[PDB]
Amino acid sequence: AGRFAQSQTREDYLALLAEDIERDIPYDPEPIGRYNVAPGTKVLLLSERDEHLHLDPVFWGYAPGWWDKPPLINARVETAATSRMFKPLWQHGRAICFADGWFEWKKEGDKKQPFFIYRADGQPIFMAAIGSTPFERGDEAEGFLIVTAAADQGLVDIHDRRPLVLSPEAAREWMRQEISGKEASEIAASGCVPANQFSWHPVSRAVGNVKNQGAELIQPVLEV
DNA sequence: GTCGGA
């Protein structure tokens, strides 16, 4: 997962997590309005610190000083809990990135066709993220990654990997600072939303170019 | 110390 839509108001997403969570984030009624959220930008990220929830703009990408290559944007759930690189993020930098759905590109030959993937029941998604804390320091190299998992069922037909999406109840547990890395691994294993809860459709190729914006990017298209 | 298009 390297592109998604986060277009609604923050209250719209937070209300699915809990009554209290929505009250605990300062009021900002503006729809986030982003139909083409791309790595290397700052993205509103939900987390907990000092027993309080926070929604901060955080760089999507992770590139510590000692990392000579371009920023990572994903971390594999298979190994992130024990990775030399991601272990500290799994333990102390868990977060949630909400979204309306995400884009995946199917490589039908030498070209790519984008699909928008969303919950069949019309709810937004909560993607599991890990990152560098303190998140609020506006670091532009040490941000967050979206945790990935193996594509299951029909998603396998689009791409071999997928974001780890948590149910709202799991998303709330994921963010708790007092839990073990092992508890987090069990939340990730127990709270993942399987492919049969999603629908998807092809969308215009225009989304691939980050310059393109607007609700059209997620509309279904005929020709593929 | 690892994994999107353009």
Numbering used by the authors: 2 to 225
The authors write:
The replication-associated AP site repair protein HMCES protects cells from strand breaks, inhibits mutagenic translesion synthesis, and participates in repair of interstrand DNA cross-links derived from AP sites by forming a stable thiazolidine DNA–protein cross-link (DPC) to AP sites in single-stranded DNA (ssDNA). HMCES contains a catalytic SRAP (SOS Response Associated Peptidase) domain that is conserved across all domains of life. HMCES SRAP is similar in both sequence (29% identity/43% similarity) and structure to Escherichia coli (E. coli) YedK, with the highest degree of conservation within the DNA-binding channel and at the active site. An invariant cysteine at amino acid position 2 (Cys2) constitutes the extreme N-terminus after aminopeptidase removal of Met1 (18, 33) and is required for DPC formation in vivo and in vitro.
SRAP DPC formation likely proceeds through a Schiff base intermediate formed by nucleophilic attack of C1′ of the AP site by the α-amino group of Cys2 (22, 34, 42, 44). In the absence of the Cys2 thiolate side chain, SRAP does not form DPCs and instead generates DNA cleavage products indicative of DNA lyase activity. To visualize this Schiff base intermediate, we determined a 1.8-Å crystal structure of YedK C2A with AP-DNA in the presence of borohydride. The electron density shows a linear linkage consistent with a reduced imine between the N-terminal alanine and the ring-opened AP site. The active site residues in the trapped Schiff base structure are positioned almost identically to those in the wildtype YedK DPC. The main notable difference in the C2A DPC structure is that Glu105 only exhibits one conformer; the interaction between carboxylate and DNA phosphate is not observed. Interestingly, we did not observe a Glu105 conformer in contact with the DNA phosphate in the C2A DPC structure. This is consistent with our proposed mechanism in which Glu105 likely deprotonates the Cys2 sulfhydryl for thiazolidine ring closure in the last step of the reaction. Our YedK C2A crystal structure under reducing conditions confirms that the DPC reaction proceeds through a Schiff base intermediate and that the N-terminal amine is the initial cross-linking nucleophile.
